[PDB]
Design an enzyme around this catalytic site. Structure first.
Site, PDB file in Angstrom:
ATOM      1  N   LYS A  47       0.895  -1.462   0.073  1.00  0.00           N
ATOM      2  CA  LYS A  47       0.011  -0.050   0.000  1.00  0.00           C
ATOM      3  C   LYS A  47       0.794   1.188  -0.219  1.00  0.00           C
ATOM      4  N   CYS A 138     -13.032   4.210  17.201  1.00  0.00           N
ATOM      5  CA  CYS A 138     -11.990   3.381  17.018  1.00  0.00           C
ATOM      6  C   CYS A 138     -11.152   3.302  18.240  1.00  0.00           C
ATOM      7  N   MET A 139     -10.516   4.415  18.650  1.00  0.00           N
ATOM      8  CA  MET A 139      -9.519   4.490  19.654  1.00  0.00           C
ATOM      9  C   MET A 139     -10.086   4.903  21.112  1.00  0.00           C
ATOM     10  N   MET A 306      -9.109  -3.504  17.018  1.00  0.00           N
ATOM     11  CA  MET A 306     -10.401  -3.329  16.866  1.00  0.00           C
ATOM     12  C   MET A 306     -11.453  -4.531  17.531  1.00  0.00           C
ATOM     13  N   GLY A 343      -5.283   2.627  14.868  1.00  0.00           N
ATOM     14  CA  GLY A 343      -5.250   2.240  13.277  1.00  0.00           C
ATOM     15  C   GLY A 343      -4.829   3.475  12.470  1.00  0.00           C
ATOM     16  N   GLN A 344      -5.468   4.653  12.598  1.00  0.00           N
ATOM     17  CA  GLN A 344      -5.189   5.860  11.786  1.00  0.00           C
ATOM     18  C   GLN A 344      -3.947   6.225  12.026  1.00  0.00           C
TER      19      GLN A 344
HETATM   20  N1  LIG Z   1      -5.117  -2.619   5.067  1.00  0.00           N
HETATM   21  C1  LIG Z   1      -5.704  -1.829   6.192  1.00  0.00           C
HETATM   22  N2  LIG Z   1      -4.964  -1.703   6.975  1.00  0.00           N
HETATM   23  C2  LIG Z   1      -5.586  -0.865   8.128  1.00  0.00           C
HETATM   24  C3  LIG Z   1      -6.674  -0.060   8.015  1.00  0.00           C
HETATM   25  C4  LIG Z   1      -7.361  -0.495   6.639  1.00  0.00           C
HETATM   26  O1  LIG Z   1      -8.731   0.104   6.560  1.00  0.00           O
HETATM   27  N3  LIG Z   1      -7.122  -1.219   5.785  1.00  0.00           N
HETATM   28  N4  LIG Z   1      -7.431   0.649   8.808  1.00  0.00           N
HETATM   29  C5  LIG Z   1      -6.667   1.126   9.964  1.00  0.00           C
HETATM   30  C6  LIG Z   1      -7.460   1.414  11.058  1.00  0.00           C
HETATM   31  S1  LIG Z   1      -8.252   3.045  11.191  1.00  0.00           S
HETATM   32  C7  LIG Z   1      -7.865   0.588  12.067  1.00  0.00           C
HETATM   33  S2  LIG Z   1      -8.854   0.785  13.466  1.00  0.00           S
HETATM   34  C8  LIG Z   1      -6.987  -0.837  12.056  1.00  0.00           C
HETATM   35  C9  LIG Z   1      -7.981  -2.006  12.192  1.00  0.00           C
HETATM   36  O2  LIG Z   1      -7.059  -3.073  12.707  1.00  0.00           O
HETATM   37  P1  LIG Z   1      -7.740  -4.427  13.242  1.00  0.00           P
HETATM   38  O3  LIG Z   1      -8.624  -4.257  14.482  1.00  0.00           O
HETATM   39  O4  LIG Z   1      -6.525  -5.035  13.306  1.00  0.00           O
HETATM   40  O5  LIG Z   1      -8.579  -5.234  11.872  1.00  0.00           O
HETATM   41  P2  LIG Z   1     -10.111  -5.452  12.030  1.00  0.00           P
HETATM   42  O6  LIG Z   1     -10.261  -6.606  10.956  1.00  0.00           O
HETATM   43  O7  LIG Z   1     -10.975  -4.448  11.893  1.00  0.00           O
HETATM   44  O8  LIG Z   1      -9.849  -6.255  13.413  1.00  0.00           O
HETATM   45  C10 LIG Z   1     -10.725  -7.233  13.791  1.00  0.00           C
HETATM   46  C11 LIG Z   1      -9.974  -8.260  14.198  1.00  0.00           C
HETATM   47  O9  LIG Z   1     -10.748  -8.551  15.558  1.00  0.00           O
HETATM   48  C12 LIG Z   1     -11.593  -9.526  15.464  1.00  0.00           C
HETATM   49  N5  LIG Z   1     -12.922  -9.828  16.354  1.00  0.00           N
HETATM   50  C13 LIG Z   1     -13.989  -9.805  16.071  1.00  0.00           C
HETATM   51  N6  LIG Z   1     -14.864  -9.986  17.095  1.00  0.00           N
HETATM   52  C14 LIG Z   1     -14.163 -10.058  18.235  1.00  0.00           C
HETATM   53  C15 LIG Z   1     -14.153 -10.268  19.709  1.00  0.00           C
HETATM   54  O10 LIG Z   1     -15.362 -10.599  20.186  1.00  0.00           O
HETATM   55  N7  LIG Z   1     -12.897 -10.188  20.398  1.00  0.00           N
HETATM   56  C16 LIG Z   1     -11.572 -10.125  19.897  1.00  0.00           C
HETATM   57  N8  LIG Z   1     -10.755 -10.181  20.676  1.00  0.00           N
HETATM   58  N9  LIG Z   1     -11.575  -9.834  18.499  1.00  0.00           N
HETATM   59  C17 LIG Z   1     -12.560  -9.993  17.521  1.00  0.00           C
HETATM   60  C18 LIG Z   1     -11.938 -10.060  14.083  1.00  0.00           C
HETATM   61  O11 LIG Z   1     -12.222 -11.408  13.734  1.00  0.00           O
HETATM   62  C19 LIG Z   1     -10.903  -9.476  13.228  1.00  0.00           C
HETATM   63  O12 LIG Z   1      -9.895 -10.503  12.900  1.00  0.00           O
HETATM   64  O13 LIG Z   1      -6.377  -1.125  10.949  1.00  0.00           O
HETATM   65  C20 LIG Z   1      -5.715   0.201  10.286  1.00  0.00           C
HETATM   66  N10 LIG Z   1      -4.763  -0.390   9.247  1.00  0.00           N
HETATM   67  N1  LIG Z   2     -18.372  -1.907  10.097  1.00  0.00           N
HETATM   68  C1  LIG Z   2     -17.226  -1.391  10.541  1.00  0.00           C
HETATM   69  N2  LIG Z   2     -17.002  -0.032  10.186  1.00  0.00           N
HETATM   70  C2  LIG Z   2     -16.068   0.706  10.532  1.00  0.00           C
HETATM   71  C3  LIG Z   2     -14.938   0.017  11.131  1.00  0.00           C
HETATM   72  C4  LIG Z   2     -15.079  -1.456  11.243  1.00  0.00           C
HETATM   73  O1  LIG Z   2     -14.233  -2.222  11.615  1.00  0.00           O
HETATM   74  N3  LIG Z   2     -16.156  -1.861  10.728  1.00  0.00           N
HETATM   75  N4  LIG Z   2     -13.729   0.965  11.651  1.00  0.00           N
HETATM   76  C5  LIG Z   2     -14.219   1.965  12.039  1.00  0.00           C
HETATM   77  C6  LIG Z   2     -12.641   2.698  12.171  1.00  0.00           C
HETATM   78  S1  LIG Z   2     -11.463   2.083  13.408  1.00  0.00           S
HETATM   79  C7  LIG Z   2     -12.555   3.874  11.499  1.00  0.00           C
HETATM   80  S2  LIG Z   2     -10.932   4.462  11.563  1.00  0.00           S
HETATM   81  C8  LIG Z   2     -13.452   4.511  10.452  1.00  0.00           C
HETATM   82  C9  LIG Z   2     -12.757   5.200   9.222  1.00  0.00           C
HETATM   83  O2  LIG Z   2     -13.881   5.611   8.355  1.00  0.00           O
HETATM   84  P1  LIG Z   2     -13.573   6.879   7.337  1.00  0.00           P
HETATM   85  O3  LIG Z   2     -12.698   7.666   8.118  1.00  0.00           O
HETATM   86  O4  LIG Z   2     -14.981   7.452   7.319  1.00  0.00           O
HETATM   87  O5  LIG Z   2     -12.932   6.034   6.202  1.00  0.00           O
HETATM   88  P2  LIG Z   2     -11.899   6.600   5.201  1.00  0.00           P
HETATM   89  O6  LIG Z   2     -11.940   5.976   3.677  1.00  0.00           O
HETATM   90  O7  LIG Z   2     -10.454   6.775   5.759  1.00  0.00           O
HETATM   91  O8  LIG Z   2     -12.057   7.930   4.854  1.00  0.00           O
HETATM   92  C10 LIG Z   2     -11.149   9.221   4.696  1.00  0.00           C
HETATM   93  C11 LIG Z   2     -11.824  10.049   3.642  1.00  0.00           C
HETATM   94  O9  LIG Z   2     -11.051  11.299   3.683  1.00  0.00           O
HETATM   95  C12 LIG Z   2     -10.636  11.540   1.990  1.00  0.00           C
HETATM   96  N5  LIG Z   2      -9.460  12.297   1.790  1.00  0.00           N
HETATM   97  C13 LIG Z   2      -8.249  11.724   1.694  1.00  0.00           C
HETATM   98  N6  LIG Z   2      -7.272  12.656   1.449  1.00  0.00           N
HETATM   99  C14 LIG Z   2      -8.084  13.916   2.168  1.00  0.00           C
HETATM  100  C15 LIG Z   2      -7.450  15.340   2.351  1.00  0.00           C
HETATM  101  O10 LIG Z   2      -6.273  15.678   2.272  1.00  0.00           O
HETATM  102  N7  LIG Z   2      -8.624  16.253   2.412  1.00  0.00           N
HETATM  103  C16 LIG Z   2      -9.795  15.809   2.986  1.00  0.00           C
HETATM  104  N8  LIG Z   2     -10.562  16.680   3.288  1.00  0.00           N
HETATM  105  N9  LIG Z   2     -10.293  14.492   2.652  1.00  0.00           N
HETATM  106  C17 LIG Z   2      -9.297  13.718   2.111  1.00  0.00           C
HETATM  107  C18 LIG Z   2     -10.720  10.168   1.181  1.00  0.00           C
HETATM  108  O11 LIG Z   2     -11.239  10.314  -0.170  1.00  0.00           O
HETATM  109  C19 LIG Z   2     -11.979   9.490   2.196  1.00  0.00           C
HETATM  110  O12 LIG Z   2     -13.223   9.603   1.977  1.00  0.00           O
HETATM  111  O13 LIG Z   2     -14.376   3.357  10.071  1.00  0.00           O
HETATM  112  C20 LIG Z   2     -15.120   3.165  11.039  1.00  0.00           C
HETATM  113  N10 LIG Z   2     -16.158   1.987  10.425  1.00  0.00           N
HETATM  114  S1  SF4 Z   3       2.280   3.007   7.646  1.00  0.00           S
HETATM  115 FE1  SF4 Z   3       1.007   1.182   7.476  1.00  0.00          FE
HETATM  116  S2  SF4 Z   3       0.120   1.196   5.266  1.00  0.00           S
HETATM  117 FE2  SF4 Z   3       2.064   2.689   5.306  1.00  0.00          FE
HETATM  118  S3  SF4 Z   3       3.697   1.371   4.602  1.00  0.00           S
HETATM  119 FE3  SF4 Z   3       3.710   1.050   6.923  1.00  0.00          FE
HETATM  120  S4  SF4 Z   3       2.446  -0.739   7.448  1.00  0.00           S
HETATM  121 FE4  SF4 Z   3       2.251  -0.171   5.065  1.00  0.00          FE
HETATM  122  O1  LIG Z   4     -11.747   8.283  19.992  1.00  0.00           O
HETATM  123 CL1  LIG Z   4     -10.177   8.931  20.568  1.00  0.00          CL
HETATM  124  O2  LIG Z   4     -10.550   9.373  22.537  1.00  0.00           O
HETATM  125  O3  LIG Z   4      -8.986   7.603  20.666  1.00  0.00           O
HETATM  126  O4  LIG Z   4      -9.771  10.556  19.963  1.00  0.00           O
HETATM  127 MO   LIG Z   5      -9.543   3.062  13.166  1.00  0.00          MO
END
Ligand SMILES: Nc1nc2c(c(=O)[nH]1)N[C@H]1C(S)=C(S)[C@@H](COP(=O)(O)OP(=O)(O)OC[C@H]3O[C@@H](n4cnc5c(=O)[nH]c(N)nc54)[C@H](O)[C@@H]3O)O[C@H]1N2
Ligand SMILES: Nc1nc2c(c(=O)[nH]1)N[C@H]1C(S)=C(S)[C@@H](COP(=O)(O)OP(=O)(O)OC[C@H]3O[C@@H](n4cnc5c(=O)[nH]c(N)nc54)[C@H](O)[C@@H]3O)O[C@H]1N2
Ligand code: SF4
Ligand SMILES: [O-][Cl+3]([O-])([O-])[O-]
Ligand SMILES: [Mo]
Ligand SMILES: [O-][Cl+3]([O-])([O-])[O-]
Ligand SMILES: [O-][Cl+3]([O-])([O-])[O-]
Ligand SMILES: [O-][Cl+3]([O-])([O-])[O-]
Length: 721
Positions: A47, A138-139, A306, A343-344
């Site tokens: 990525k 998320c956090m 998460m 995550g972010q």
């Molecule tokens: N490639 C990629 N990488 C990313 C992101 C992305 O969108 N794409 N997003 C970033 C962000 S913002 C975040 S928050 C992270 C998310 O990173 P992770 O949290 O590592 O990814 P998820 O798949 O959302 O995590 C869910 C894991 O928790 C498990 N789970 C489900 N139910 C339960 C439960 O009851 N207990 C426990 N212990 N586990 C459970 C699911 O099976 C799954 O494997 O990734 C970050 N990095």
């Molecule tokens: N079912 C389910 N839902 C989830 C989650 C899950 O595990 N399961 N994870 C949650 C978590 S941990 C997270 S972090 C959220 C993330 O969810 P979102 O934050 O809604 O997802 P992103 O695709 O990261 O959105 C970032 C946006 O910013 C835009 N963008 C990119 N660069 C720029 C810039 O320079 N300026 C501006 N203004 N915009 C820009 C991108 O096009 C994109 O639309 O999702 C949550 N939603």
């Molecule tokens: S910050 Fe995350 S997405 Fe970017 S290169 Fe490192 S592990 Fe891969």
């Molecule tokens: O949702 Cl936070 O208290 O990790 O900014």
């Molecule tokens: Mo996240």
């Protein structure tokens, strides 16, 4: 030739926070490599490596757009007309209805400086605490977990600890897919020392489990009972650390009243391995195995994401991991810490540390705290009582407020809530309020949220401008500007300042020409707090590949071990004890006897399956960026549902079948992947696909402390289409 110049920065994706070098030739980015001097040592995952075609995409929002009427078409509009429209709407809404009719909804992808200016315009300019953002999603549970256990937010160790850990306890984390370069660092540790033990605890069996010695595939929701049961074994087998917990730990009973070690012991009798094994549906020996690995090891590190946080018991789940480290003293030493994974890229810097949530103020200050507000009024030059004493709307409550008409104007910045908020059918109704005024700062025109925007502003993207990202290990890293923004894109820092001015905010409040100006105020604001990063001048951040806080002067190297005498500058040199958990009034961390429960919506005869949602490696969130990279997009173009092998056999569903996934809230047709990834009784969907909005299926229930939703568990049924 390609690059004539290399510009140092940070990857636009995960909270691993890999430093990057962008190669530029004639004003255009042509190449990218890893920063050899940042923690990732020049390594990026695929990525990160494929970020130049995102930066060079022509499918960008490059001029301001207005929707004249609800359900009309977005049409071009001048920056000048956009800004007056925005400022007069916000001003006159306050004029008519008061400051609580307006809100900022931002993100951990915003630069620290953007979030800082936005937070300040609203809390100090408008006088409303309606500032929230996606880290709520998320956090928030890890923040609550850290604050209640330690009294301060953020990990007490760093990524460096991976190199010294002797046991990894990895729970609710697909590190392989979600933190690729970090997972490689863990794998590497295990290759260097094959004696290293790895327990991966996740209802799904992912690539992450393939390096583990034990994969605990527990039933969704039952990890709290699992972790109490590990504490039971640890204490029963005299594997605990009385010299540590007797000096450094306090105990709190099931009601949050002071208790003691004997009380802890009596509480854990509710969580004996034999009983918990049936609850969790795991062999009992996995309980003993995990507990022993954790406690007997020379240095143990936990890492979670998460699976743990996206839970109505998220804060409690965090506390339970901290309990393990506190009862064993597996903390405050190299390789031994409790390490929440973020995550972010900038949830930590921009939102958590910067206090850009509804109940928070910058650098560990709180809204309900009178002294804190006074501190901020003084720092921001505000009159006494300008900052409102009650928290604004947390995220779920915010979009509820929008639905009722209570919040009339909203800025959405660098997030896609129409795709990512839970219970989308309720949310979409809310975002359709005919009298709402919604401004979107968004780079990519294919974001589904824009279908609700009344006004769109074109921003500078990533390294089209400069700014700081704070990743998961307390590292603050500068991205310098590498290329010019295209079309009429402008940096959001400047956009925010011009809006504030036109909207009648005191000019002294937004006295910033650029992100460097706001960084210098934010440094001042941090000074003397336990976040002090006064020592992180622009010049240092230009030269260095990141600095880790606390970093209080220009000659300070930053801090790796928090709470340690002689390592952490917040610990007085003459503190009588080697450790000092200075976030608590007596200097002691806290073990919490949290009662283990389940999901807000549990399976029953009618909806007999757990349904979870997860990351996929090839796509970042809503895929408005990764979807522009052909090799990324082709690898996973569409949504699917994971189904257990053995559930599909008993039910007549074959791999590749179209099935209907149905919850109380909606129903959706998806192709089935039948394998052993999901344990029996569990199904799993990814959420990158805008054509298959899976958050329509999920419930909106929230942890009552952190207010983070339970995206990880609801109740579903499956039938063949
Ligand atoms: N490639 C990629 N990488 C990313 C992101 C992305 O969108 N794409 N997003 C970033 C962000 S913002 C975040 S928050 C992270 C998310 O990173 P992770 O949290 O590592 O990814 P998820 O798949 O959302 O995590 C869910 C894991 O928790 C498990 N789970 C489900 N139910 C339960 C439960 O009851 N207990 C426990 N212990 N586990 C459970 C699911 O099976 C799954 O494997 O990734 C970050 N990095
Ligand atoms: N079912 C389910 N839902 C989830 C989650 C899950 O595990 N399961 N994870 C949650 C978590 S941990 C997270 S972090 C959220 C993330 O969810 P979102 O934050 O809604 O997802 P992103 O695709 O990261 O959105 C970032 C946006 O910013 C835009 N963008 C990119 N660069 C720029 C810039 O320079 N300026 C501006 N203004 N915009 C820009 C991108 O096009 C994109 O639309 O999702 C949550 N939603
Ligand atoms: S910050 Fe995350 S997405 Fe970017 S290169 Fe490192 S592990 Fe891969
Ligand atoms: O949702 Cl936070 O208290 O990790 O900014
Ligand atoms: Mo996240
Ligand atoms: O001035 Cl509007 O395009 O929000 O009706
Ligand atoms: O302190 Cl919290 O972000 O759990 O509300
Ligand atoms: O734990 Cl805080 O979000 O008050 O920095």
């Amino acid at each position: 030739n390609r690059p004539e110049k290399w510009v140092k920065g940070v990857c636009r994706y995960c909270g691993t926070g890999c430093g990057v070098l962008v190669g530029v030739k004639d004003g255009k980015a042509v190449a990218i490599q890893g920063d050899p001097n940042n923690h990732n040592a020049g390594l990026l995952c695929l990525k990160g490596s494929l970020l130049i075609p995102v930066l060079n995409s022509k499918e960008r929002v490059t001029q301001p757009l207005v929707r004249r009427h609800k359900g009309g078409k977005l049409e071009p509009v001048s920056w000048d007309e956009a800004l007056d429209l925005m400022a007069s709407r916000f001003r006159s809404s306050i004029d008519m209805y008061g400051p609580n009719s307006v809100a900022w909804y931002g993100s951990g992808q915003c630069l620290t400086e953007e979030s800082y200016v936005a937070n300040k315009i609203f809390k100090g300019g408008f006088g409303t605490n309606n500032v929230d953002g996606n880290p709520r999603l998320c956090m928030a549970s890890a923040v609550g977990g850290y604050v209640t256990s330690f009294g301060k937010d953020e990990p007490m160790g760093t990524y460096a600890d991976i190199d010294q850990a002797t046991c990894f306890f990895i729970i609710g984390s697909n590190t392989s897919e979600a933190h690729p370069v970090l997972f490689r660092r863990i794998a590497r540790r295990k290759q260097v020392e094959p004696g290293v033990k790895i327990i991966v605890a996740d209802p799904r069996r992912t690539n992450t489990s393939r390096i583990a010695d034990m994969h605990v595939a527990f039933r969704p929701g039952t990890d709290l009972a699992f972790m109490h049961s590990m504490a039971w074994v640890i204490i029963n087998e005299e594997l605990d650390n009385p010299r540590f917990w007797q000096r450094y730990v306090n105990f709190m009973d099931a009601e949050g009243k002071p208790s003691d070690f004997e009380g802890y012991k009596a509480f854990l009798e509710n969580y004996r391995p034999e009983k918990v094994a049936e609850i969790c549906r795991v062999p009992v020996e996995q309980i003993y195995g995990a507990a022993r690995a954790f406690a007997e090891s020379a240095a143990t590190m936990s890492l979670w994401c998460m699976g743990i946080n996206q839970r109505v018991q998220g804060v409690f789940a965090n506390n339970l991991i901290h309990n393990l480290h506190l009862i064993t003293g597996q903390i405050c030493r190299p390789g031994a810490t409790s390490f929440s994974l973020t995550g972010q890229p900038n949830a930590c810097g921009g939102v958590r540390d910067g206090g850009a949530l509804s109940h928070l103020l910058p650098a560990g200050r709180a809204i309900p705290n009178a002294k804190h507000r006074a501190e901020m009024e003084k720092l921001w030059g505000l009159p006494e009582g300008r900052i409102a004493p009650e928290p604004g709307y947390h995220t779920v409550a915010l979009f509820e407020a929008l639905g009722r008409g209570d919040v009339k104007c909203m800025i959405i910045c660098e997030t896609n809530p129409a795709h990512t908020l839970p219970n989308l059918n309720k949310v979409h109704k809310a975002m359709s309020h005919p009298e709402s005024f919604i401004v979107c700062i968004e780079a990519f025109p294919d974001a589904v949220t824009l279908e609700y925007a009344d006004l769109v502003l074109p921003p500078a993207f990533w390294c089209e401008r400069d700014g700081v990202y704070g990743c998961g290990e307390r590292r603050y890293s500068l991205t310098e500007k590498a290329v010019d923004p295209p079309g009429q894109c402008r940096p959001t820092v400047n956009t925010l300042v011009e809006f504030a001015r036109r909207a009648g905010v005191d000019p002294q409040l937004v006295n910033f020409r650029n992100a460097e100006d706001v960084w210098n105020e934010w440094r001042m604001v941090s000074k003397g707090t336990t976040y002090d990063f006064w020592g992180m001048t622009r010049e240092r951040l230009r030269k260095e590949s990141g600095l880790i806080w606390p970093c209080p002067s220009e000659d300070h190297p930053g801090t790796s071990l928090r709470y340690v005498r002689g390592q952490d500058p917040c610990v007085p040199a003459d503190h009588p004890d080697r450790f000092f958990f200075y976030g608590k009034p007596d200097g002691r961390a806290v073990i919490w006897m949290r009662p283990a429960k389940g999901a807000a919506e549990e399976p029953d005869a009618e909806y007999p399956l757990y349904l979870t949602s997860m990351r996929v490696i090839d796509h970042w969130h809503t895929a408005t960026m990764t979807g522009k990279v052909p090799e990324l997009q082709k690898a996973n173009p569409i949504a699917f549902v994971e189904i257990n092998e053995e559930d599909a056999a008993r039910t007549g569903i074959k791999h590749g079948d179209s099935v209907i996934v149905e919850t109380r809230r909606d129903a959706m047709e998806l192709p089935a992947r039948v394998s052993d990834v999901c344990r029996p009784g569990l199904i799993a969907v990814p959420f990158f696909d805008p054509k298959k909005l899976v958050n329509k299926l999920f419930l909106d229930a929230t942890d009552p402390v952190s207010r983070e939703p339970e995206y990880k568990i609801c109740a579903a049924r499956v039938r063949k289409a």
